[PDB]
Amino acid sequence: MKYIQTEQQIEVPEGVTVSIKSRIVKVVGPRGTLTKNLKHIDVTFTKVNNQLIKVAVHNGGRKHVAALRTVKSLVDNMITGVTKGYKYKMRYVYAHFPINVNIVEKDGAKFIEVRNFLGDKKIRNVPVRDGVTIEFSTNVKDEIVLSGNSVEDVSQNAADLQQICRVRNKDIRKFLDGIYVSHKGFITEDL
Amino acid sequence: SGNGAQGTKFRISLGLPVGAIMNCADNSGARNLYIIAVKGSGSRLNRLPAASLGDMVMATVKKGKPELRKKVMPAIVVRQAKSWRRRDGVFLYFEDNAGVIANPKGEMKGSAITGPVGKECADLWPRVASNSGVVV
Amino acid sequence: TLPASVREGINIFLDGHIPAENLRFRTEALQFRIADATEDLQNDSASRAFSYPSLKKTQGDFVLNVEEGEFSDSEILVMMGENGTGKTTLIKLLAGALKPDEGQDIPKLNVSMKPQKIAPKFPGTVRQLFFKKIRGQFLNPQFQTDVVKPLR
RNA sequence: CCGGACGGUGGCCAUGGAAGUCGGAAUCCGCUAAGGAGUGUGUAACAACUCACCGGCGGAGUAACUAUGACUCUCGCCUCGUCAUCUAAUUAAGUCAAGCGUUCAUAGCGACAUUGAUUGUUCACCCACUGAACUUAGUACGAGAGGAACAGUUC
């Protein structure tokens, strides 16, 4: 029915400045900086005050308006990732064959190398994305940890690994082998 | 080939199409073997399936103890006659076509094999090795 | 069985089956990996494993000499030779149980070791002892096949 | 998003055992903000979940047996036949959802209703073969019974 305006708040916090021209967002904070291109959408960003920025759609349909919250969220997670940062934890899972996971490097590379997966004669590799670092958690068994400023790059790097270890030709409910994402959170603690 | 055949086999010239009769070269009581099928052979309109050295066939006994006649059983080709060629470059051939009656797993029905036996068969079917004298 | 020849008896033994008796005495046949059979991997891990320099251990009645060698990761090394050669001594040094007369091997590595002659000297029962070492290894199916079910 | 979900009592009869939850009706009482003689998940059987509803957010008869029919009475189609014999071998689409599915309508199904032999052989019917084999592995899962693959190898 077309809503004359709907808007959203993107709250801004002490250590960050976010700058927008055309629909190109640059968020810069303590942890480094992130920029994303919002041209594909049609919203109007407006600054109210260093700690506040609005986004609004004029005369929009259901689907347009639906995209407005998702703009808010997208720029939120840019802001939080530049403050708290993002940390995804994954754990290895296997019934018999111990999944051995390393980090190798061919030509400035960085890859996550998975050996022995279910006995699997093939050697699996998932490339580490830029902006994301990998620690094999000390003090915990078969836990890998992906962290960085961009939820999108951490999350996808994570899913690349889990998906490189899908099982074939077995009852996937009995053969539960894998590396699953086990905890989604932040880099800075207390929060 | 197939069951109980531990090993692969390099292609060798097909000597024996269906209908061919080879000498029975064991002591089972069988005098000959009449080939009705080759195992593991493929399909092309009009082509006879045809066996070679160390192939497992499906045969009946045309001449031999009546307890062996009137039925189909597995056999293994042990000597050829159609000349074939090994990877050492050699074109070689036996004086007769002959094989030995056997079970799906590949066990000889008999206990001896009379005459020589080509190595490619010996290499293929251990219980055939056992009962072989001169190989190749 | 009835008496047999030397060659013949050995051959039948390895088959795991005896015909007259018609018994498959052994459930699975023994086979050795060809070395064609093994998996092909580029091995190093962290570039190679640890390495030991020349070592010497002298009791004063026997002297052992060792030539510098290297060990790599995910590999397996056999040690052969006659007893009294210091096959046992060498392993101990690497265990850190023995101190070399000369040479040194101080590794960062965590080592597990099994001794050659086993005489009991642990108070406790068998289950308690193995559970302290690790439970969960006891859960694995591999361990059921090899230890638990066969002996009981 | 979350907290609370309570006493009469495990209502009553049917009850093998049915304490709200296969079933036959009946729907009350006290509680207090609100809590159904009880929405669905139910261990047999309570629980233990949950949710509603308060709240934080030309035809017949006949039998000391079946069948047949000695007897009395009246005016080669089907067929590729069956048994042998000769062959290894032989004509020589969707809707509705009542139902099944032991517990459950839709996993899997759904009434009603409705939108080389042998032959001219095609066909049909056998005899054989084989994407397969090899290790992966008699493994993982399974009380067993049994039983994988991705990798590599040869056809």
Swiss-Prot record, chain A:
**Where is this protein primarily located?**
cytoplasm
A Pfam family cross-referenced in the UniProt record is: Ribosomal_L6
Q: Which GO terms describe its biological process?
A: cytoplasmic translation
Keyword Ribosomal protein: yes or no?
yes
Q: Which GO terms describe its cellular component?
A: cytosol; cytosolic large ribosomal subunit
- Highest taxon of source: Eukaryota
Q: Which UniProt keywords apply?
A: Cytoplasm, Ribonucleoprotein, Ribosomal protein
Statement: the UniProt record of this protein carries the keyword Cytoplasm: yes
Which purpose does this protein serve, as stated in its record?
Component of the ribosome, a large ribonucleoprotein complex responsible for the synthesis of proteins in the cell. The small ribosomal subunit (SSU) binds messenger RNAs (mRNAs) and translates the encoded message by selecting cognate aminoacyl-transfer RNA (tRNA) molecules. The large subunit (LSU) contains the ribosomal catalytic site termed the peptidyl transferase center (PTC), which catalyzes the formation of peptide bonds, thereby polymerizing the amino acids delivered by tRNAs into a polypeptide chain.
Protein family:
Belongs to the universal ribosomal protein uL6 family.
Protein name, per record? Large ribosomal subunit protein uL6A
Organism name: Saccharomyces cerevisiae (strain ATCC 204508 / S288c) (Baker's yeast)
Show the taxonomic lineage: Eukaryota, Fungi, Dikarya, Ascomycota, Saccharomycotina
Curated annotation (Swiss-Prot), chain B:
How it assembles, according to the record, is: Component of the large ribosomal subunit (LSU). Mature yeast ribosomes consist of a small (40S) and a large (60S) subunit. The 40S small subunit contains 1 molecule of ribosomal RNA (18S rRNA) and 33 different proteins (encoded by 57 genes). The large 60S subunit contains 3 rRNA molecules (25S, 5.8S and 5S rRNA) and 46 different proteins (encoded by 81 genes).
SMART domains membership: Ribosomal_L14
Cellular component aspect of the GO annotation: cytosol; cytosolic large ribosomal subunit
Protein name in UniProt? Large ribosomal subunit protein uL14A
Location in or out of the cell: Cytoplasm
The alphabetized list of GO BP terms reads: cytoplasmic translation
Xref: HAMAP family: Ribosomal_uL14
Q: Which residue stretches, if any, does this entry annotate as coiled coil? A: none
What is the role of this chain?
Answer: Component of the ribosome, a large ribonucleoprotein complex responsible for the synthesis of proteins in the cell. The small ribosomal subunit (SSU) binds messenger RNAs (mRNAs) and translates the encoded message by selecting cognate aminoacyl-transfer RNA (tRNA) molecules. The large subunit (LSU) contains the ribosomal catalytic site termed the peptidyl transferase center (PTC), which catalyzes the formation of peptide bonds, thereby polymerizing the amino acids delivered by tRNAs into a polypeptide chain.
The reply on keyword 4Fe-4S is no
Task: Please outline how this chain is modified post-translation.
Answer: Methylated by RKM1 at 2 different sites, but it is unclear which are the 2 methylated residues among Lys-39, Lys-105 and/or Lys-109.
Q: What more does the entry say?
A: There are 2 genes for uL14 in yeast.
Please list the residues that carry the modification N6,N6-dimethyllysine. 105, 109
- GO terms of molecular function: large ribosomal subunit rRNA binding; structural constituent of ribosome
Q: Chief location of this protein?
A: cytoplasm
Family designation: Belongs to the universal ribosomal protein uL14 family.
Q: Keywords in alphabetical order, please.
A: Acetylation, Cytoplasm, Methylation, Ribonucleoprotein, Ribosomal protein
Q: Which domain of life is it from?
A: Eukaryota
Swiss-Prot record, chain C:
Q: Where would you find this protein in the cell?
A: Cytoplasm; Nucleus
Q: Which residues carry this modification: Phosphoserine?
A: 45
Can you say what this protein is called? Translation initiation factor RLI1
**Any extra detail in the entry?**
Present with 6280 molecules/cell in log phase SD medium.
Q: Which residues of the full protein are shown?
A: 305 to 456 of 608
- Of which family is this protein a member? Belongs to the ABC transporter superfamily. ABCE family.
Q: What does this protein do?
A: Component of the multifactor complex (MFC) involved in translation initiation. Required for the binding of MFC to the 40S ribosome. Required for the processing and nuclear export of the 60S and 40S ribosomal subunits.
Subunit field text: Component of the multifactor complex (MFC) composed of at least RLI1, the eIF2 subunit SUI2, TIF5/eIF5, and the eIF3 subunits PRT1, HCR1, NIP1, RPG1, TIF34 and TIF35. The complex associates with pre-initiation complexes. Interacts with the complex YAE1:LTO1; the complex bridges the interaction between the CIA complex and RLI1.
Positions binding ATP in this chain are 81-88
